[PDB]
Amino acid sequence: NARVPADLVIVGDKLVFLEALERRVYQATRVAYPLIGNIDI
Amino acid sequence: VDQPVHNYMVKRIHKRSLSAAFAIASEALSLLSNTYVDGTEIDSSLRIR
């Protein structure tokens, strides 16, 4: 194993990661980030 | 009166891929493929570049 700096939160009774990976990946490249999706009304 | 039930399911694989490009200019190919013809003081710097 390795010790890796990444923040962990706890919700309800479950321990989950919480990643907002925008700086390591999808930065300084020409791809559109997912989770920026569109809706129609 | 109810009796126990068993279930069976089958899922298959799905194939995807990744692609990434990588270009080398023709001048660099001519530099790298001299096959023991060059070796002066100015071709070495271009080969290093």
Binding site: A28, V31 | L18
Partner: protein, 49 residues
């Protein structure tokens, strides 16, 4: 009264610049500075170039 003397480097504005001495500045026609910035990429699939 005696005037108080202020030195430039003692200010907090001195962190916003890198000062250096240059005696022969008046003989500089067009000073020039360069940048070489590279960018990463994302490998993907589909009928994209």
């Amino acid at each position: 009264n005696t005037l108080n003397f202020v030195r430039f480097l003692e200010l907090g504005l001195s962190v916003a610049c890198i000062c250096t001495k240059f005696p022969e500045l008046a003989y500089v026609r067009d000073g020039v500075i360069q940048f070489e910035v590279q960018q990463p990429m994302i490998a993907r699939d589909g009928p994209h170039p």
